[PDB]
Structure formats: C-alpha cells, structure tokens
C-alpha cells in the first residue's frame, strides 16, 4: 500500500540474471539525460524509471541510494535472492557481501552493483587493454619512417601488454572482478549525482530544443509526483524543490571527507594507483554535480534574498571544507575538475552574498517581498560568515578571491552606514551642547541590525581590514583574470564544462560583482577587460546561433542587462561608446559579443544594430589644424564645452565621399592630458568604419582625422562587421529578407567609385597577405581570419561575389603554377593565430561546397568554370591539411578534433555532392580526393590521421561534464568513420584500390570494434563501418580476410554480444537496424568464423 516498492528500480533477481530485464544503472540514466539526449529520454524504460515513486525518494534524499548497511537491508538481501545453468548465485552473493563490507553500503545496493557489473561484462572486455598482437596491427597500419612517433605516443597511451589467452585468465580472477566491482560502484555514484543534476535541468527548463519537445507529459509527471509542483495549479507549491538545496548541501561534507581518505574498511591492494585516482575523481564529480543542482535551486528565486539559514549553512560548509581548496591533485583526470569545482564554489557563494541586493538594502533602497529575509538582519550570521571569508583572504585561497572582493564591498558599505548614523547622532549632541552652554539627554545612535557585529571586529572605527581584502583580491589574488577563466569554464564555448544555460546564469554572479565594484574602481583596463571576458564566455564567431541557450529567455539576462541595467549600461556600455573610436577595442568588442549572443531576441538586436547605424557621438584625437574651426561654449573655464564654428572633414584628399561635421555641432575636450575631443556628431559607425577601411588600402592617398587604424583595430573592426552581418542574416525572414543586404550597403554607403565594403575587405585580404607574405606577424594573421569570417558571413547574401573573388583569392588559387598561398603561410608553424587562420579557411571552404548543393535548386558571379577551380583548390588544400595534421602541434586536442572533423567533412561532401550539380563542376575536386586516398603511393601515410581519430575516440575521458568536448570528439569520430565507408564503396565501385585502405581498416578493426563500448554515439557509426568493410572484402576476387581473425576469439564474442545488447536498453529503431545490417552482411559475405560466433 503505502511503502514504495523496490521492484521497478531493482527487478526480481531471476529476470536480471537471465537477461530478460537489463537493470537501468545510473550510468545509463545519466547518459539518457546528457546535454544532447532526447530520443533516449522518451524510451519506456527511462520514462518508467523517472516516474517511479521509489526513485523519487532517492532524488529527495540522496543518502538513501548507497545507504550504510542495516538489518533491514540484510533481510531484504536474503529475500531478494531466496526467490530463485549456474551464473554462480553463490559467487554473486559472495561479491555483494564483499562489496557491501568494503565500501560500507547496504547489501541491496551492493547487489544492484554486482548485477550491473555482471550485465556489462562484454563492455568491460572491450574497454580493457589491447593484446600485443592488436598493437602490432595498429603499428603496421601506421607504418611510417618518421610519423610512427606520433603513432607510438598513441600506442603507448592505449596501454599495451597482453597475450589474449591469459587476458581472459586475468578477467575471470577474483581480484580483477572485484576491482571491476569497485569501479562499477564508483561509476554509479558519479552517475547518480550527474543524473539528479541533469534531471533538474530537464524539469526546470520548459520548451528546450530536444526532439519533439512534448516531453512535457514526462516533465509534469515528475514535477507533481516528486516535488508536488503543479504548473497548472493556482499558486504552485515549491517547498519540495526548495528543500533540495539544504539537502544536497549536506552531501558536500561527505564528498570532502571521501576526497581525503578511502574507507579504512577496504581490502589492501584494491588500492592501486588507478583506484586512488578514480576514488578522488568520484568525490570531486559528486561535489560538482551537487553544486550544479544547488545553483539551479537557488536560481529559482533569483533577484531576492536567499533564506538566511541557507546562507549560513553554505558558509559553515565552506569553513569546514576550507572552500574546497585542499584537494589531492596529482592526475590529469583530477586536474580538469578543479576549475569547474572552484567556479561553482565562487558562483554559489556570490549568489548567496548577493552583493547587488545587499548594497541596495543597506542604502534602504529596496523593499523586501512577503517572506524575504536578508542574512544582514542578524549580526550573528554576519559574525560567522565574516571569519570564514576573512580566513580565506588571509590564506590567499585563489579561487575565493571573488567572494573576498564582494565581501569587502559589503563591509565598506556597513562601515559607511555606521559613520553616517554616528555623525547624524554626534550632530544632535553638538546642537544640544550649544543650547546647554548657554548661561541632560544622552542622545544615542540610530540602531542598525549589523552594528554589534561591526563593533566586534572594530570595523565601525577601522575599515582597513576591508580595504586590505580588496587589495589582496585585485592584486596578488588576480580576481579579474580569475573570473575571466571561470567565465570560460562557465561559458558557451568548446572548453566549457557546463550546460550553456547553467553557465549563463552563473556568470551573472560575476557580472553583479563588477556592477558594484565600478563604484570604487574607475573604468580601468582590468575590470573592463574582465567584463568583456565574462560576456564573451569563451565563445567565437563559429558559435553564433539563431537560437538562445536551450531556448531559454532568462539565459540571455547577462547579455540584455548591458542594456537594461542602469549601472552596467552607464558605467560600462555607454562609457565604452563615449570613448570610441579613440579607444577602439572595448566598444567594438562589446557590440560584437552582444549582437552575436542576442540573435534570438529581436528587441535587443535592433537596439544594438540601431546604435551602430545611429550613433550619437564620436571621440577622436583633435587635429591641431582645427584650432580655429571652433568656439568655446561656456561655463567654469572650459577644457570642456566648445562649438564648431566651421565644418571639419574627417577625410581629406592628398569627391563627395567625405565625413564632414557641420558647424554648430557641440563638443568637449576629454583630457587636458592630451588632445582628445568628444563630438556630438550623430552618424553611422558601420558606414564610418567602412570608409576608414578603404583609406587604409590607399596608403597615404587620403588624410584621416581618425588616424591610421592599426592591426588590432583591423582585426576587431572586421570581426564586428562579420558578426553583425551574420546576426542580421540569421534574423532575416521570408517576409523580411535582405537584412544582411541592408547591412552590406549601409557599410558601403560612404565609399568611392561605386565600390562596396565587399571589395574593400577583399582588397584588404589580398593586400594583407602580400604584407603577410612577410609572415612573421600574428596580428596581421588574425586580420586574415576576420576577412575570411566576413566572406563566410557574406556568402548567404551575395554568393556570386564570394565565388568570383575566390577565383582570384591568392590564398588558394594553385591555379596557373602552384600559387597556393594559405599552405605556405599556415604550415610554417601551427599555434595561436595560425590555427585560427587555418580554421577560418577550412570553415569557409566548407560553406563553399555547401553553397554548390543549394545552387542546384545575387548569384551572378558563379559559373561552372569558376566553381570548378575553386572547389578543386579547396580539395587540394583540404588533402594537404589533413595529411599534414599528423605531424602538426595544435593548441589543444579539442582544437585538433575540430580541425580534423571539418577538413574530413569537406572531402566527404565533395564525393557526396558530385552527382547532383558530363563531368560536373565538383567532379575534378571529387576526383582529386578519390585519387589522393586510393593511390598506395602515399595511402600508407595518409591513413595515420584516420587512425589518430580512432585512438583519440578510444581515449575520451569518462566524464559527465565537459560535454561539448565529448560531442566534438564524437563528431570527429563519426565523420572519419563515415568518410572511410564512402571510400571503401567508391573504391569497390571503380574496382581500383581495394588493396591497402581495406587492409589498413582490418589492421585497425581491433580498435574500431572496441569503440561501441566507449560511448553510445560511437556504436552505430563503428558497426556501420565494419559492415562496409566486410561487404568490400566479399567483393575481392579471392578469399576475404577473417574479421574474427583480426579481433580474436574473445573480443569477437564480446562484440557480437553488444550488438544484441545494442537492441536492448532503449529500444531505439536505429540501433536494431544496425545490428540487423551487420549480422546480415556477415552471413552473406563468407565470414564463417564470425557467422558461427553469431549463434554461440
């Protein structure tokens, strides 16, 4: 009746051991809730799991899940297994009781883990180290006289030593099985908290962009069932959701304890080096996902004081855990979790301090809501929080510097409030003094709710401690650089650790700190730069999207607040405009960042674009040759106000294309330390920059009042142009197109000779690259990126112009006699700006071949002739890059993964689009790629990057954060695998090749077949490839190479098992079809050994 049953979460043992019921482990549940995940969340298994009342109890009270053993659970453990070929019930029983004793969980929970391990042994086999023979195969597939070094470092890391026969002897041992049990347990712990975190993100974010987002029935079902939250109710009860925060805060003390010691109840020599890392990694991961949850809950009541009990609970925790700073940090797995952990710690602390509402409340400038109560109301609260934050500031714990900084402001404001009331009181004391010395009431001070705390620390008469905290944090504490890093971590770029939604709401705390510190700090280089970083969040031009972070409206607050918030807008945003273009970077950076981020919000985009087109002022260096073209308007003694008596032209010859500012326009000099003037001249920033751009080309044929724009201003200015063009493009409709068109002509509204901004950027591009033919300069190399990005953005609005220019674009046009300039200029080195340049080219090339597919359905500059040489050069360059990537040194492996995915993608699209455009315009390009890979003159060297992807994928860390990193490696793998399949097909299709490329894939089959046990998204592309391999071998005139032969007996048994386990867990139609395709081709292509293995 009342007692919620365990049976749905833990099926009867018999149905598990048989294979009927596959237990939904937390790992699978977690994967079903991953950032991409959508289809998996629909499946009946997961739907039932999330709708289970028993599961709901674990969600509210996480200590239940792996709760300590009791006689109540010992009893259930006997009952659970008194219901029942030997899978050895006694071995399973032995293990469950061993596990329960070693990590001190209850026998039922241990039994759950034991079965999970048992039902995933096939996966365990494949994730183990390769056999020695397998390594020999990879080595031979690589086979280079020099580039085997990069192959060697990869093989060394794949972990190598095994004779397959004894590997099974190891695997079956009692020791090895129980290490797997510990690892399965640690895996389940990580996944449990990851699941809870991801579940809340799923519930609290309606209208997410998943597949068929009427996942609302599931959302509503869980909300009402687990948290009593009825959205359709009059006033929804949130007390249960709220209760999650104090609950999960409690779990954090545990994570911190475990992070310091393994349970002294665990058998020795389970304690390998591998186990210690896994143990620590789990504790940290649990901490990170709990904190993510806590934040989501706090953010439910944002713009409002948290409950004081919540505020003090958190800071008491930070006190006992020393702000989560002392952690054992040896391995890399542990290392990449530190920044995310610290980011959440800072953000949560800031969220709870709520520096913005706190300062406003102290100035009696805010009215509390019904049940709102600030922690400031109590001196006792403040006393506890103070010593904690002060201790962090004294120890110089780096990650806590934002908290120290925010607190120093709060302290100062309390001190000011006290001094004000003290003077107000001492004034009355002196009025009554005066009236008394003519020819008895001892007037006291106005009472505050924080005074007795102030006195206890002497902060009422001595504010030096607060000043010093700010000094520590801005100085040696490097809080500005620190927040910039946390903003990348909490960003929306490829290095981001968290969901964009969470990150966007968290970065908000950092922005509030800068909003308030601007009162004490001016408009200085550091806070400004930091603010730009917090806004940027590590994004770039390629990340620009037509949609908001998970379609969330409030996720864009951090961006929209730059407009709507009086302090940020006046102190930062409008402040940057008031000094543009005299100071170019900040204003230009900010418009680029905001417009890129605000694409989905029309009212915000119009305000930013409108400002660029209708800009009220202009700030520049005063030309001393204008000392008679102005009269002082008056007051004070004015270095300030003046009025232009004559007209002044910003641009002079040595034409009606000039920038003149009519007389009467008012101005103001802005330094007295220099000669800078702010002119109230309304104008178009874009139109102006376009003309500045044009002047820079003519090399002294013009005069500029604005000066020659430098390399940095060249980079920033074009990127802004690119971004704004791109943004306006994505906002355009079929009822309102030509938005990008308008932006192009608005920027071309001031040029000469019937010339466009298009021509200016293209001429800039060509001129730059002859200047960049010197090749030593990064800033110029970066400017090349911007030109390419503009060209990319310009492609959708005027395709023909871009194609027409690419024909003469010196970067590629190998053309007449190998005039390939991008290759020479990029190859020289492969770091920093060079990578960005090469990426921009690749990305632009990819859009070009995309343009040919939609051209087969304004366009005037595109002819078959031109499209053929352009795409041929692209193919030529793509192959060159792809091949060279083997030896190159990229900034990071994530960066390499982007490069490889996009370069291989280009070549894949060339072969795939050749038939839908007689040879055909894409034919020579497609032929170039085909001939490049089929010729064994270099095929034995042109396979290495393919294998590198294979091994990179095989070594993707097991993490539930850094999902964007995992999506990217997955896209690199998938793209390479699918490219390999198209190669095999085309090779068979024209009967050439077969030979080496097919052979190399067989040599690589040992790695390929292990992929499906690394990630779900790997499964279908890997299997699909092996099927294409088997089908190709069946088309060879002799007897096809045995696939079972290469993989070995045991690996094959495990692989085939998984192809059946592929069908099972989520019931996806696609998974079933790939197993069917694989088995069908095995049975039809003379792989008898594999065929028989299929049935055993």
Numbering used by the authors: 1 to 84, 92 to 446, 460 to 674, 683 to 885, 903 to 962, 971 to 1149
What does the paper say about this structure?
Nucleocytoplasmic transport across the nuclear envelope is controlled and facilitated by nuclear pore complexes (NPCs), very large, modular protein assemblies. The Nic96 complex organizes four architectural proteins, Nic96, Nup157/170, Nup188, and Nup192, as well as the more disordered protein Nup53/59. Nup188 is a stacked helical protein with intrinsic flexibility. Moreover, we can show that both Nup188 and Nup192 specifically bind to FG-repeats and translocate across NPCs by facilitated diffusion.
The N-terminal fragment (Nup188N) includes residues 1–1160 and its structure was solved to 2.65 Å resolution. Nup188N crystallized in space group C21 with one copy per asymmetric unit. Nup188N is built from 52 stacked helices. They fold into a large right-handed superhelical ring that resembles a lock washer. We can discern an inner ring of helices forming the concave surface and an outer ring of helices forming the convex surface creating three distinct subdomains. Between helix α32 and α33, we find a β-stranded insertion with structural homology to Src-homology (SH3) domains. The Nup188N ring structure is closed by four helices (α10–α13) from subdomain I that latch onto a complementary surface created by helices α44, α46 and α47. In total, the latch covers an 1511 Å2 interface. In contrast to canonical SH3 domains, the SH3-like domain in Nup188 has a different β-strand topology, which represents a circular permutation. The most regular part of Nup188N is subdomain III, which was found to be structurally similar to nuclear transport receptors (NTRs).
